């Protein structure tokens, strides 16, 4: 990038002009060009909002660092009716939005559905009750 020593050399040169230049016999530096892998997948199935139009979605870099931030940012959710085995009745409509990779575990699934949350809290209060 033409070292300022070259500016001093070509512009107003002292009788003694001393420059330092890196020695490369054949030049031709490496091309670099990292390997990127674009991934397309169906995420946030049945969202609650219109979400985003195409061509505005882009491709978002992902890694182990932002993964949970990519879930929480993308807000993947699921809403469906399921038979209620707890107290007869019929289909139970549940709405779940997973904000972390741990939210697919059955514990977090139980904590997100409000009824199963009340039952799970009941169990933690009784099991915590049997021990002092």
């Amino acid at each position: 990038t033409t070292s300022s020593q070259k500016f001093i050399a070509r512009n107003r040169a002292p009788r003694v002009q001393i420059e330092y230049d890196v020695e490369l016999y054949g030049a031709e530096k490496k091309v670099q060009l990292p390997f990127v892998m674009g991934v397309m997948a169906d995420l946030a199935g049945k969202p609650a909002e219109p979400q985003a139009a195409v061509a505005d979605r882009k491709f978002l870099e992902i890694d182990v660092d932002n993964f949970d931030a990519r879930l929480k940012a993308m807000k993947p959710r699921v809403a469906f009716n399921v038979p209620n085995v707890l107290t007869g009745e019929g289909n139970l409509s549940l709405d779940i939005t997973f904000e972390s990779m741990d939210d697919f575990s059955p514990a977090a699934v139980a904590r997100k559905v409000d009824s199963l949350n009340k039952l799970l809290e009941a169990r933690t209060q009784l099991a915590n009750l049997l021990t002092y």
Binding site: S93, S115, A122
Partner: protein, 52 residues
């Protein structure tokens, strides 16, 4: 025996229906009318589109 069934009766019912799960669901097969409505739209749109 049946005493635990009464405890999970009161707990399961009280927790389940007290606030959340509004109106729940009973018979959702009433939405099969959409099958008949759609069927009528196929019967009509077939004639509209297939006309000379």
């Amino acid at each position: 025996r049946e005493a635990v069934e009464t405890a999970v009766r009161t707990l399961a019912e009280h927790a389940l229906e007290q606030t959340s799960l509004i109106s729940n669901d009973a018979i959702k097969s009433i939405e099969s009318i959409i099958a008949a409505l759609d069927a009528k739209l196929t019967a009509q749109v077939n004639l509209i589109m297939h006309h000379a």
